[PDB]
């Protein structure tokens, strides 16, 4: 099928701390170790990104993300159970259950695209979120200082 273009928000640099315990930071870093955009960050960028991630407390039955909505946040599970279902041609189907661990919304860190699924908390829970724009500003501002050529 023909491939559509993608485009994120512009930010020409050339032209934010959410307190966390040492334990919380370590667990969070360990959960993003396999995330593409994180694996490629320099140590200082990682530290700044981890500081920017905010806590998102959720109540049972609460919808973390609704399929089709605009996506601007990436989430990593800290605790709690979540359900994952996708509506296909009108047919709602469960695609699994989260159990206190996991991550989702990774693509939101690059550009906005409709959420591919709805994720609802099936019990009290907590997640760590990261805004795409906040993330980009951090990485770009830091990389803008690097000499090139």
């Amino acid at each position: 099928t023909r491939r559509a273009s993608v485009c994120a928000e512009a930010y020409n640099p050339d032209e934010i701390i959410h307190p966390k315990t040492d334990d919380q930071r370590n667990r969070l870093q360990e959960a993003c170790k396999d995330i593409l955009l994180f694996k490629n960050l320099d140590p200082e960028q990682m530290s700044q990104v981890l500081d920017a991630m905010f806590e998102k407390l959720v109540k049972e039955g609460e919808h973390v993300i609704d399929q089709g909505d605009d996506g601007d946040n990436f989430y990593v599970i800290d605790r709690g159970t979540f359900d994952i279902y996708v509506k296909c041609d009108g047919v709602g189907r469960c695609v699994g259950n989260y159990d206190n661990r996991g991550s989702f919304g990774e693509l939101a860190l690059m550009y906005n695209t409709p959420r591919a699924a709805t994720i609802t908390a099936t019990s009290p829970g907590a997640l760590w979120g990261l805004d795409r724009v906040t993330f980009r500003r951090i990485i770009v501002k830091n990389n803008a200082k690097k000499r090139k050529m």
Binding site: R2, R3, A4, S5, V6, C7, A8, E9, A10, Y11, N12, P13, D14, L36, L37, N40, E106, L107, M110, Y111, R136, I139, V140, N143, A144, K146, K148
Partner: protein, 343 residues
């Protein structure tokens, strides 16, 4: 030798002068909606679609791209859209689609381009499966010359892909979709393009330059010769993971020269990537894969095209897929006027 065939020094110098002059002096409302009969949709996009139209007075056919202003604002593409029109109206090259007219009304922005009836290279590539290396080389040479031209003007194209390359009646390429084209003298940062064609530096927000276009050419050549892109997966993240790794696998039928060219274009380290070294584009023009390329004949469009789309006459859209049609409605209230004044 390849680079010694044609002398482009003074040509690029004059082309730059002409571009700068036109870039600073775009025309506004050089036509209006009621001067065209809308015939059929040739393709659709996020802001609207491109329709085949007939200029009522001259009878000539054109391709009109319609962009819904409110949608452009919502998707935060105001700057890109203004750049698209301002740059396209200022460039001139044998392989670039020509912008004939442009205008706007209460609801949309309109770019009337010359109609390229041959269809997207994408459709032909998907139907044929894969192009022979000579066939792929014919198209590649045209892109090489086009980027040499665009880059000399300090422009970056940013969306090279078969879907944006149209085949004209002589079988030559006509680059369309300047949606992401931008004047860049140092480096830029917007994450944009098409997934399969994004260079590693774009994906990772490292800041980038014209080298991303050369990377995209590597992706294009590979796709043309293999029938599929070098980095592919059913999900975007997986595509990006493969791109960043850069590990590429070549079909067994790829010639040694092709593989070498591709290893140099698909170089993850932009400082070692062909097109971005000391000799710039000459490294590509001089590569063994292009040894049999007559760059002059390509530019003058004298080489016999390995493939020519079928044509009946003006208005023929058989080379394009069918799309759901819809009447163009123009609001009675001006939408987003302030943001698009320059258009």
């Amino acid at each position: 030798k390849g680079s010694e065939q044609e002398s482009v020094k003074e040509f690029l110098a004059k082309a730059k002068e002409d571009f700068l002059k036109k870039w600073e002096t775009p025309s506004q409302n050089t036509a209006q909606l009621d001067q065209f009969d809308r015939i059929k949709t040739l393709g659709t996009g996020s802001f609207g679609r491109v329709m085949l139209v007939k200029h009522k007075e001259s009878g000539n056919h054109y391709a009109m791209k319609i962009l819904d202003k409110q949608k452009v604002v919502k998707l935060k593409q105001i700057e890109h859209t203004l750049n698209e029109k301002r740059i396209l109206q200022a460039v001139n090259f044998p392989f670039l689609v020509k912008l004939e007219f442009s205008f706007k009304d209460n609801s949309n922005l309109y770019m009337v381009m010359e109609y390229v009836a041959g269809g997207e290279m994408f459709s032909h590539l998907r139907r044929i499966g894969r192009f022979s290396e000579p066939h792929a080389r014919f198209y590649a040479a045209q892109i090489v010359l086009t980027f040499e031209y665009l880059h000399s003007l300090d422009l970056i194209y940013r969306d090279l892909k078969p879907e944006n390359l149209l085949i004209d009646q002589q079988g030559y390429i006509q680059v369309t979709d300047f949606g992401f084209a931008k004047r860049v003298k140092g480096r830029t940062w917007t994450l944009c393009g098409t997934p399969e064609y994004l260079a590693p530096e774009i994906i990772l927000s490292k800041g980038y330059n014209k080298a991303v276009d050369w990377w995209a050419l590597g992706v294009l050549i590979y796709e043309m010769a293999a029938g599929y892109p070098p980095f592919f997966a059913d999900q975007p993240i997986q595509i990006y993971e493969k791109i960043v790794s850069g590990k590429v696998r070549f079909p067994s039928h790829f010639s040694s020269d092709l593989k070498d060219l591709l290893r140099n274009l698909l170089q993850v380290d932009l400082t070692k990537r062909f097109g971005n070294l000391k000799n710039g584009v000459n490294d590509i023009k001089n590569h063994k894969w292009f040894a049999t390329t007559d760059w002059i004949a390509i530019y003058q469009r004298k080489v016999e095209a390995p493939f020519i789309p079928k044509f009946k006459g003006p208005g023929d859209t058989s080379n394009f897929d069918d799309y759901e049609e819809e009447e163009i409605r123009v609001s009675i209230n001006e939408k987003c006027g302030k943001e698009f004044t320059e258009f």
